[PDB]
């Protein structure tokens, strides 16, 4: 009882955060997966415009994070990651978002250096014949309007479930009265049919579509289409044997189909190097499965399984004859395939419940990765590695020990983990140069190998609930983009050390008054060049205060961010580079929520009450074609008002 808005999420069990994405969140998320991570300490976000941020976890970017949707993986097709994996995820339409920090699981795919992230839906539990609806409407500054409907009907034997949404916002303004190019629009409709013959069985087919557009204050091109499309089939059988607790089988298909241009939103910058109307279409076809058995007997729990994943990428672009001024749009030429990846793996995880206060946990997986370059030419010139292939075999695993204190309600844990990761599409194809003496990046960029120590504690008290997690680790053959002036990238392997932590606490002062706080630090050194790693988000703290009283509640929130002076100029990732140290800043916010009926909640909020003008260290450099000076990064929104209503029947 007693509703409120989510300003931070605490680490509830060791290494693991779990939150329900359907709750409101204090700086309102732009209906995008990265934004539902801001409220989890350790996550920072590279802003591209109004939405579609690239999420960074403990300084770690890109495929270093496994983002899953119903156990399945979905990748975008932009060579500059305009349509990052989270670009396609509306959390509101899911039922559970869960994060495991570190390389401390092997059940959910390969090369999870930084952490894995699992957006899930749960299958309906229908006894009688019956229905449930639940839905939300939101309304904010700058045209921000969102609709979300999730409904289902069924009985003991089966169910049908529709979930969908539509969301949009106009260009927002920063704290200096500047309209930031940041229009965006999204929608999504997925259905799920489920068959449950007995309670020990469940089969479930699911399909869905989504589209979206989004203007990008970074970039220099905009996203006029981000088509997504998904199939899925999952099998779950409980209590086969007395030791065979459950079997899981799961297949997934995920197609992405993006269109970027410089004329469907914005006008071609006449002084740029794209003064001509231009577009480029791109798509990514991902197919994959997973099969896993959970054995429980005596004091142990073994979870063996295998998984596989294939994915394919193609592109095609417009042409402009500038003496007819004729424009042949990119849908007239044929798709050129340029890359196919494969991966198969096997994994197990064993947990020993020694005594009732000690847990030992171990896991390994073996992954066989491979990739073939299909580019017959380059940007035209010859591609010296056309139709070439490569592969590798990448063992990864971990151990974690967790002890429960005798008296206080405290858990301690320490864990050691190794994770190897094959280069992703962007590390291999998107850079214009490889390492020195290499022909291109594809030929020589080495798989990245991470070894890291995690530890921390949980205090699950009465009035005081605290947690902390730290990490120290090294990174062999870290993959690192280096920028030279058009402007050109080079990908290299370097060695790195990393160190950091997160901690937080929430104290229930009196029966009405609650306060909480959080701290997030990351740190990275490039050992190869003796210098700092780029794109590391500075130290930040969050303070919350909350009054609750029966049916209603009111909140305040302080975000305070230190400056980042550890930077590597003209180095970074496929998306962005460092150039200047960042300023610190404070942002303050208010919120309230009210339970009208058993079925209708209300909430509202002011974000950035004092209309602070600020930008974040990780945000992209703004485009010269809009009013952006050299290297000036895209600013965060100024003051924004939002109200939101939540139904459930
Ligand atoms: Ag693009
Ligand atoms: Ag051009
Ligand atoms: Ag362009």
Numbering used by the authors: 66 to 444, 451 to 556, 560 to 723
Paper quotes:
Here, we show that Pseudomonas aeruginosa OprC is an outer membrane, TonB-dependent transporter that is conserved in many Proteobacteria and which mediates acquisition of both reduced and oxidised ionic copper via an unprecedented CxxxM-HxM metal binding site. As indicated by the successful structure solution, OprC contains a single bound copper and shows the typical fold of a TBDT, with a large 22-stranded β-barrel occluded by an N-terminal approximately 15 kDa plug domain that, like in other TBDTs, completely occludes the lumen of the barrel. The copper binding site comprises residues Cys143 and Met147 in the plug domain and His323 and Met325 in the barrel wall. The CxxxM-HxM configuration, which coordinates the copper in a tetrahedral manner, is highly unusual and has, to our knowledge, not been observed before in copper homeostasis proteins.
While OprCWT and most single alanine mutants can be (partly) loaded via Cu(II) incubation, this is not the case for the C143A mutant. We hypothesised that removal of the cysteine could lead to much lower affinity for Cu(II), so that after SEC, nothing remains bound. To provide support for this, we determined the crystal structures of the OprC C143A mutant cocrystallised with Cu(II) or silver Ag(I). For each crystal, datasets were collected at 8,800 eV and 9,175 eV to distinguish between both metals. Bound copper is expected to give a strong anomalous peak only at 9,175 eV (which is above the copper K edge at 8,979 eV), while bound silver will give comparable peaks at both energies (the silver L-III edge is at 3,351 eV). For C143A cocrystallised with Cu(II), no anomalous peaks are visible at both energies, showing that Cu(II) binding is indeed abolished. Crucially, in the presence of silver, the same 3 anomalous peaks are visible as for WT OprC (compare Fig 3A and 3D), strongly suggesting that the C143A mutant can still bind Cu(I). All 4 residues in the OprC binding site contribute to copper binding, but not to the same extent and, in some cases, not equally for both copper redox states. This is illustrated by Cys143, which is essential for high-affinity Cu(II) binding but dispensable for Cu(I).
